[PDB]
Amino acid sequence: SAVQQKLAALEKSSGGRLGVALIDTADNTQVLYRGDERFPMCSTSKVMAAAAVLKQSETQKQLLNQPVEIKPADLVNYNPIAEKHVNGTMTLAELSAAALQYSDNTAMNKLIAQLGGPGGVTAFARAIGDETFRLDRTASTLNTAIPGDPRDTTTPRAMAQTLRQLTLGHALGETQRAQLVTWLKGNTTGAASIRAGLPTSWTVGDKTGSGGYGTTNDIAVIWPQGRAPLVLVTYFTQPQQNAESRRDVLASAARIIAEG
């Protein structure tokens, strides 16, 4: 397809490896580029962990208001929000918002612990039909993003389908889904990624991720005006362990998708 030639050209220009999955819910049509290849999720896995806690809250109605202690020993390699509450508490709602909107790794680790370990996050993915997602490590090491390493990976197709079920579908209770959508729309880390390649009148909710090998990811749900929503996954990784971030590639992929 024309979109696929333009994505392949973007990839060639970039020096790295690009994975894209678009779901157009107006007709459930899909555009894929390396859609079944594995990529390191990096912090985009925080969406699955937040959604898994939201699922628990369908039975434990007050779960999101539960306070969780933040201890000095809990603070890891990137804790912009949790550091503000050391020797205090944050609720699981506040930890979910910090994980999603600031990519706070201590917050993510509290979600993982609430779920009984990374296997509890993977379990939720399996329960909603995602057989590809796997979370293996906690937040300080899950984004090493080593080529060929299956840990902490998924494919663009699988993550696009899962994100659609979580935000537009009914994998979550209606109120939980609405909460996740609100959190994603309030993300603060995405301005240079998918959002930068889209018309300024489209509403976006997204979660970014970055890691070793210049891995630069973004997963988004997109609401154009007067048109059915879209789900877009853009994953990107590079050959050199020390490679720099390339959020521009994700913006460019989004732009190509939107023009198609």
Ligand code: NA
């Ligand atoms: Na690495």
